[PDB]
Amino acid sequence: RRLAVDLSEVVIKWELQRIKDQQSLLAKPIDKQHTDTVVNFLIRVACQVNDNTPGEVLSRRCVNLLKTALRPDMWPKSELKLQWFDKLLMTVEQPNQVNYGNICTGLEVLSFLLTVLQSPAILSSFKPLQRGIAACMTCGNTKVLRAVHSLLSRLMSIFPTEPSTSSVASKYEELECLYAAVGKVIYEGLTNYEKATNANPSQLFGTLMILKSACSNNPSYIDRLISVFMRSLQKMVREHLNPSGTSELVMLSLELVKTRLAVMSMEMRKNFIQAILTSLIEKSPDAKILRAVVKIVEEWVKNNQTPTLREKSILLVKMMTYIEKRFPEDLELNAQFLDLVNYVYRDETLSGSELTAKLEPAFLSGLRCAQPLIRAKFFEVFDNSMKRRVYERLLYVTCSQNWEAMGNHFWIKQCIELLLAVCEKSTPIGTSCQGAMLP
Amino acid sequence: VVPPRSLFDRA
C-alpha cells in the first residue's frame, strides 16, 4: 500500500516539476483523468488505511499529499467521488466494531474539501453526505464529536443557519436535512439533560459542540432554545459548584449566551446575572472560569444588547470582593480585573456614577498593587483627579480620602507618591549641598 | 475649608 502511495506521490511530483518548468509534448500537462484518479485514490487510501486500534502514518502522508494535490496551481476543480463516504459514516451507527480513525480522517478530508471546492460544487457534492454527517453527531466518541464539530463549523460558516425560527431548516435542500438533524439533536440533548435525574455534564458535550457550530456564523440561533438552554446552564453551574470537561462546557455555554440578553425573559436574565455569574464569581474554584467571566464583563462594559448599569455594578462589586480574596496568587486574573476597573475609572460616561463610588476599594487595591504596571496606571488616574498643588493635595489626604479601604497597607507610600508628583520634573538635578559636592 | 473632590464622590 505504501508503494501505491509512492506512485501517487510520483505523479504529484511530476506535476510540481511541470509547474516549475512552465514558470511541446514534454511540457504539456498530464491528462486530467489521471489526476482525477490519483486524487480519488489518495482520498480513499487516506480514509481506509487507519488502524482500528502503522497505517496512521501513511494516512497522514496521504492527507498531506492530497492537500498538496489540491492547490490554486495543482489540479483545482478536479472531479471527486464522495458517494463511498456514505457507507463509511454509517459505520458509526454500528457499535460492535468501527474504525474511528477512518471516521476522523474522512471528516478532516471533508472539511478540507470544503475549503477546496467552489460553493455550488460544495452544495452539489455534500447532499448524500448529510445522512452520514448526521449519524456521527450521536456517537459517544469525543474525537468524532470534535471532528464533526469542526466540519459543521466550516460548513455553517460557508452557509449560516436560518434566523427568526423560520420553518425551513435551510434555504438549501442539500443543507435542509443536515440542518434539521442538527437542530433536532441539539433540542433532544438539551431536553434530555434537563430531564435527567442524575447525569454528568459530559452528556451535554456533543450537544454543546454541535450547538456552538450552529451558532458560529449566526448568533441568533440560540434564541430558539433560550429557555431550555438557560435551564441546562443552571444545571451545569449547580453541578460544577457542588460536584475537568465541566469547566470547558460551562465556558462554552457562557460564550453562547453572553450576547443574547435581549432575548431572555426578565426572570431568566435576572437569574443569569445575579445567580449564575455571581455564584461563579463567589463559589467557582476554577480560575479559568473566573477569567472567562471577567472577559465577558469587560466586553459588556467596554461596549439593550448589553446589561444595565445596575447589573454591571453588581458583577463588578462581586468581582471586587471575591477575586482578590479567593485567588491572591493569580497575578494575571487580578491584572485583568484591575485593568477593567482602570477602564471604568478612566471612562467619562461612568465618572461620578454610583459605580465609581462602589469600586473605591478596587481602585485603592490598584494603587497599592504589587504589580508596578497596574500601580502606575492607577496612580496616573489618581494623579489627574486633583490639582498639582501642595496645599490641595495635603488637604486631599487629610480630608477627602477615606483610607480605610487600604486595609493594613502603609498608605503613607501613596501620600509620598502624590506630593512628589507636584515637584518640577524637567529641572536639571542639583543640590544645595555645595560643600559635599565633588569639585 | 472645602475638601477637594475625589473620584469616589457621587456627582
From Swiss-Prot, chain A:
Compartment list: Nucleus
Ranges for region Interaction with TP53: 8-308
Function: Adapter protein, which is found in various multiprotein chromatin complexes with histone acetyltransferase activity (HAT), which gives a specific tag for epigenetic transcription activation. Component of the NuA4 histone acetyltransferase complex which is responsible for acetylation of nucleosomal histones H4 and H2A. Plays a central role in MYC transcription activation, and also participates in cell transformation by MYC. Required for p53/TP53-, E2F1- and E2F4-mediated transcription activation.
Domain notes: The PI3K/PI4K domain is required for the recruitment of HAT complexes, and the MYC-dependent transactivation. Although it is strongly related to the PI3/PI4-kinase family, it lacks the typical motifs that constitute the catalytic site of PI3/PI4-kinase proteins, and lacks such activity.
Assembly information from the UniProt record: Interacts with MYC, E2F1 and E2F4 transcription factors. Interacts directly with p53/TP53. Interacts with GCN5L2. Component of various HAT complexes. Component of the PCAF complex, at least composed of TADA2L/ADA2, SUPT3H, TADA3L/ADA3, TAF5L/PAF65-beta, TAF6L/PAF65-alpha, TAF10/TAFII30, TAF12/TAFII20, TAF9/TAFII31 and TRRAP. Component of the TFTC-HAT complex, at least composed of TAF5L, TAF6L, TADA3L, SUPT3H/SPT3, TAF2/TAFII150, TAF4/TAFII135, TAF5/TAFII100, GCN5L2/GCN5, TAF10 and TRRAP.
Family: Belongs to the PI3/PI4-kinase family. TRA1 subfamily.
Disease: Developmental delay with or without dysmorphic facies and autism: An autosomal dominant neurodevelopmental disorder apparent from infancy or early childhood. Some patients present with intellectual disability and renal, cardiac, genitourinary systems, as well as structural brain abnormalities. In some cases, the phenotype is less severe, has no systemic involvement and is characterized by autism spectrum disorder and/or intellectual disability, sometimes associated with epilepsy. Affected individuals manifest variable dysmorphic features. Deafness, autosomal dominant, 75: A form of non-syndromic deafness characterized by late-onset hearing loss that involves mid and high frequencies, and progresses to encompass all frequencies.
Protein name: Transformation/transcription domain-associated protein
Gene (name only): TRRAP
Part of the whole protein covered: 2003 to 2519 of 3859
UniProtKB/Swiss-Prot annotation, chain B:
Cysteines paired by S-S bonds: none
Tissues in which the protein is found: Ubiquitously expressed.
Subcellular location as annotated: Nucleus
Domain of life assignment: Eukaryota
Annotated function: Component of the NuA4 histone acetyltransferase complex which is involved in transcriptional activation of select genes principally by acetylation of nucleosomal histones H4 and H2A. This modification may both alter nucleosome - DNA interactions and promote interaction of the modified histones with other proteins which positively regulate transcription. May be required for transcriptional activation of E2F1 and MYC target genes during cellular proliferation.
Complex and partners: Component of the NuA4 histone acetyltransferase complex which contains the catalytic subunit KAT5/TIP60 and the subunits EP400, TRRAP/PAF400, BRD8/SMAP, EPC1, DMAP1/DNMAP1, RUVBL1/TIP49, RUVBL2, ING3, actin, ACTL6A/BAF53A, MORF4L1/MRG15, MORF4L2/MRGX, MRGBP, YEATS4/GAS41, VPS72/YL1 and MEAF6. May also participate in the formation of NuA4 related complexes which lack the KAT5/TIP60 catalytic subunit, but which include the SWI/SNF related protein SRCAP. The NuA4 complex interacts with MYC and the adenovirus E1A protein. EP400 interacts with TRRAP, RUVBL1 and RUVBL2.
Family the UniProt entry places it in: Belongs to the SNF2/RAD54 helicase family. SWR1 subfamily.
Protein's name in the database: E1A-binding protein p400
Gene: EP400
Section of the entire sequence shown: 2311 to 2321 of 3159
